[PDB]
């Protein structure tokens, strides 16, 4: 799957019991954002951490 540079995670959701992340690819516009299965980002901890924060500081 070629593999591409990840800029950040935009949001998350669950489809059934599985976790998915909407990804913003570095160098690409939002027209290229895709929902990816969690396992695809597990080794992108800098990115996962920055998303956990963004959501914690927004929790109303």
């Amino acid at each position: 799957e070629d593999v591409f540079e990840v800029e950040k995670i935009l949001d998350m959701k669950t489809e059934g019991g599985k976790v998915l992340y909407k990804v913003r690819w570095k160098g690409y516009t939002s027209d290229d954002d895709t929902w990816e299965p969690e396992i695809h980002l597990e080794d992108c901890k800098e990115v996962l951490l920055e998303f956990r924060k963004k959501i914690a500081e927004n929790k109303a």
Partner: peptide, 12 residues
């Protein structure tokens, strides 16, 4: 040593 920074794209 820094994280992967990359990921595969199945969503294409």
């Amino acid at each position: 040593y820094e994280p992967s920074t990359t990921a595969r794209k199945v969503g294409r």
